[PDB]
Amino acid sequence: MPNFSGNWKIIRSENFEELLKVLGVNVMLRKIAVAAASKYAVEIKQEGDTFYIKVSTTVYTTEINFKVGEEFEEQTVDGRPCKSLVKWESENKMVCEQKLLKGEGPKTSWTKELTNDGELILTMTADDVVCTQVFVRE
């Protein structure tokens, strides 16, 4: 039965560069990252509240596994390791709060939501800045 499970392809990406700026990435790498972002693909497998997620671009791929409600280790958008915890906020929206393994830095979070119109919306937050990325089924 339809849930977050599937193969998703990005169609829109708002404020990605601004987010990277907040995370201290230099302009030239930001521009390359924006260009790289238009090939973001996401593969999800969901059973109950257990999730497998693989995000990839042209040259890079990362996988996470989590159970809602259970702390796990992942990276921030700028590849610093963090402790993560995901909770539901409604039937098809989840919110992840993150804490840096080492160091100090901006407060980062992310959300994933399946909409009525069959889109996947990712938001990624760093301090004051919110990046939104919209995906549709392949």
Ligand X SMILES: *C/C(=C/c1ccc(O)cc1)C(=O)OC
User: Site for ligand X (CB under 6 A): which residue of 8, 22, 23, 53?
Assistant: 53
- Separation CA 20–CA 29 (nearest Å): 9
Within residues 105-134, the interface with ligand X by CB under 6 A covers 110, 112, 122, 124
Residue 86 near ligand X by CB under 6 A:
no
Residue 135 near ligand X by CB under 6 A:
no
Shortest Å distance, C-beta 55 to ligand X: 4
Residue 77 near ligand X by CB under 6 A:
yes
Q: Give the total of residues touching ligand X (CB under 6 A).
A: 9
Binding mask 30-49 for ligand X (x = CB under 6 A): ----------x-x-------
Shortest Å distance, C-beta 137 to ligand X: 15
